Design a protein around this ligand. Structure first.
Ligand SMILES: *N(C(=O)NC1CCCCC1)C1CCCCC1
Ligand SMILES: *N(C(=O)NC1CCCCC1)C1CCCCC1
Ligand SMILES: *N(C(=O)NC1CCCCC1)C1CCCCC1
Ligand SMILES: *N(C(=O)NC1CCCCC1)C1CCCCC1
Ligand SMILES: *N(C(=O)NC1CCCCC1)C1CCCCC1
Ligand SMILES: *N(C(=O)NC1CCCCC1)C1CCCCC1
Ligand SMILES: *N(C(=O)NC1CCCCC1)C1CCCCC1
Ligand SMILES: *N(C(=O)NC1CCCCC1)C1CCCCC1
Ligand SMILES: *N(C(=O)NC1CCCCC1)C1CCCCC1
Ligand SMILES: *N(C(=O)NC1CCCCC1)C1CCCCC1
Lengths: 74, 74, 74, 75, 75, 75, 75, 74, 74, 74
C-alpha cells in the first residue's frame, strides 16, 4: 500500500496545478468588468451579472481540480 | 497491481491540468462579452448567445479532461 | 505487463494536457467574434462562418490529443 | 514509509505551482483598476470595491493550493 | 522490452503537449481575420488567403508533434 | 532518511516555480501604473497607492511559495 | 540498454514540447500581417515579405526541436 | 549521500525555472516605460523612477529563486 | 555508464523546451515591425534594424538551449 | 557516482527552461521600442537607451540560468 499511498499524495499535488486557470480566469472577468464600467458607467447593472456568471463558470473548473485533489488525499 | 493503481492515481491528477484551459478560455469569452456590451449596449441580445456557444465549446474541452480523470480514478 | 499498463495510464493523463490549447483557442476565436460584431454589427453574417471555421480547426488539435488518450486507455 | 514521506514533500512543493495563478490574477485586477481610474477618475468609488471582490475571489484559488500544500506538509 | 514499451507510451503522451501551440496559434490567426474584416470589410478577399496560409503553417507544427506521437505508438 | 532528504530538496526547488507568478504580476501592476500616469499625469497620487496595494497582494503569493521552500530546506 | 532506449524515447517526446513556440509564433506574425493590411491595405507588398521572414525565423526554432527529436528516435 | 547529492543538483536546476518570471516581468515594465514616454515625452522624469521600482520588485522574485538554487548547489 | 547515458538523452530533450522562448519572441518582434510599418510606412528604414537586433538577441537564448542540448547528445 | 553525474546532466537540461523568459522578455522590450518609434519618431534617441537597459536586465536573468547550467555540466 506504500506505493499506492505515495501516488495518492503526488497526484493530489499535481491536481492543484489546474487552479491557476481559475485564478487567472476570474481576474480576466473582473478586469473586463472594471474596464467596461470605467468606459461606460451607465452599463454597470447590465454587465455586473455577466461578470458573476463568468466568474462562476471559470471558478467551476478550479472547484473540480480541488475535488480530484481531495479524493486523492482522502 | 500496486504499480497499476499508483499509475491510475498519478494519471488522474495529471489529467486535471488541461482544465486550466477551460478556466481561462471561458473567462476570455466573458471578458469579450462585457467589453462588447459596454462599447455597444444595443448589441447585447445578439452577442449573448455567441458567448453561451463560445463558453460551451471551450468548456467541452475541460469536460473531457475530467472524463479521463474520472475513468482513471474509478 | 504491469509496468506497460502503468505507462499507458500515465501517458493517457499526459495526453490531455494539450487540450488546454483548444480550450483557450476556441475562446480566442469567440472573443474576436463578439468584439467584431459589437464594433460592426452589420458584419455578423460574414464573420460568423469565419469563427466556425476557426473553432473547428482549433478543436481539431484537441480532438487528436483525446484520440491519443483513448488509444492509450484502450 | 520512506516512500510515503518522500511523496508528501514532493507533493507539497508541486502544490505551490498553482499560486502563480493568483499572483498573476491579482495583478490583472489591479492593472484594470489603475487603467480604469486613469481614464475616468470619477469612477474610482464604483470600481474600487469591484477590484477588492475580484482580488478576493482570485486569491481564494491561491489559498486552496496552499491548504493542500499545508495538509501534505503537516497532516 | 517492458521498460522500452513503457517509455514509448509515456513518450507518445508527452509528444501531444506541443499540440497546444497549434490549438492557440490557429485561433490567434482567426481572431486577427475576424477583427480585420470587422474593421475593414472591403479587405476580406485579401486577408482571407493570408489567414489560410497562417493557419496551415501553424498547424504544420502540430502535425509533426502528432507524427512523433504515432511513431512511438505504432513504430 | 536518504530518500526523505532527497525529496525535501526536490520539493524545495519545485516550490520556487510559483514565484514566476509574482515576478510577472508585479510587473503587470507597474506597467498599468506607468501607462495610466503617462495618459493622465494628474491621477498619479490616486493610482500610486493602488499600485502599492496590487504589488503587495501579488507578492504575498510568492512569499508563501518561498515559505514552503524554506520549510522543506530548513524544517 | 533497456534504460538507454527508454530514455531515447522519453527524450524524443519531451523534445517536441518546444514546437508549441513556433506554432504560436508563426500565428503571431500572421495575425500582425492581417491586422496591418486591414488597417492600411496599400502596405501589403511591403509587409508580406517581412511576414515571410518572421515566419521563417520562428519556424527554424521548431525545426531544431524536431531535429533533436529525430536524432533521439533514429540515431 | 549519493542520492541526496543527486537531489540537490536536480533541485538546483528546477529552482531556476522561476527566473522566467523576472525575465518576462522586467521586460513588461520596460515596455510600458518606452510606450509611456513615446506617447507623452514630458512624463519621462515621473515614470522612469516608477519603472526602476517596478524592475527592482520583479527582480527580487528572480533573486530568491537563485538564492534557493545556490543553497542547493552549495 | 547506462544511467549516465540515459540522463544525457533525457537532459538533451528537456533542453529544447527553452526554444519555445525564441519561437515566440522572434514572432513578437516581427509582429511589432509589421504593425509599426503599417501605421507609419515612412519609418520602415528606422525600425527594420531594430527588429533585426531584437530578433538576434531573442534568438541567442534559443541558440544556447540548443548548445546544451548538443553537448548532452554528443 | 553514476547517480550524481546523471543528476548533473538532467539538472543542466532543466536549468535552460528559464531561458524562455529572456527569449520572450527581450522581444517584448524590442516590440515596445519599434511601436514607440513608429508612433513618435522624434523620441528615438530617448527610448533607445531605455530598450538597451531593459534588454540587459531581462537578459541577466537568462544569463544566470545558463551559469547554473554550465556549473552542473562542468
Ligand atoms: N472557487 C469557488 O468555489 N469560489 C466560491 C467563493 C465564494 C463565492 C462563491 C464561489 C474556488 C475554487 C477553488 C477553491 C477555492 C474556491
Ligand atoms: N464545464 C461545464 O461542464 N460547465 C457546465 C456548467 C453549468 C452549465 C452547463 C455547463 C466544466 C468542465 C470541467 C468541470 C466543471 C464544469
Ligand atoms: N472538439 C470536438 O472535437 N468537437 C466536435 C465533437 C463532435 C461533433 C462536432 C464537434 C472537442 C475536443 C475535446 C472533447 C470535446 C470536443
Ligand atoms: N491570499 C489569501 O488567501 N489572502 C487572505 C489571507 C487571510 C486574510 C484574508 C486574505 C494569498 C493566498 C496565498 C498565500 C498568501 C495569501
Ligand atoms: N493539423 C493538420 O496537420 N492538418 C492537416 C491534416 C492532413 C490533411 C491536411 C490538414 C492538425 C494537427 C493536429 C491534429 C489534427 C490536424
Ligand atoms: N515579496 C515579498 O514577500 N516581499 C516582502 C518580504 C518581507 C518584507 C516585506 C516585503 C517577494 C516574494 C519573493 C521573494 C522576495 C520577496
Ligand atoms: N517549420 C519548418 O521547418 N518548415 C520548413 C520545412 C522545410 C521547407 C521549408 C519550411 C516546421 C517545423 C516543425 C515541423 C513542420 C515544419
Ligand atoms: N536581479 C537582480 O538581483 N539584480 C541585482 C543584482 C545585484 C545589483 C542590483 C541588481 C537578477 C536576478 C537573477 C540574476 C541576475 C540579477
Ligand atoms: N536561431 C538562429 O540562430 N537563427 C539564425 C538563422 C539564420 C539567420 C541568422 C540567425 C535559431 C536558434 C535555434 C536553432 C535554429 C536557429
Ligand atoms: N544574454 C546575453 O548575455 N546577451 C548578450 C548579447 C550580446 C551583448 C551583451 C549581452 C543571453 C543569456 C543566455 C545565453 C545567450 C545570451
Amino acid at each position: 500500500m506504500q506505493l499506492v499511498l505515495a501516488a495518492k499524495y503526488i497526484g493530489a499535488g499535481i491536481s492543484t496545478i489546474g487552479l491557476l486557470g481559475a485564478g487567472i480566469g476570474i481576474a480576466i472577468v473582473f478586469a473586463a468588468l472594471i474596464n467596461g464600467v470605467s468606459r461606460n458607467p451607465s452599463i454597470k447593472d447590465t454587465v455586473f451579472p455577466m461578470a458573476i456568471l463568468g466568474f462562476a463558470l471559470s471558478e467551476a473548473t478550479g472547484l473540480f481540480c480541488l475535488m480530484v485533489s481531495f479524493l486523492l488525499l482522502f
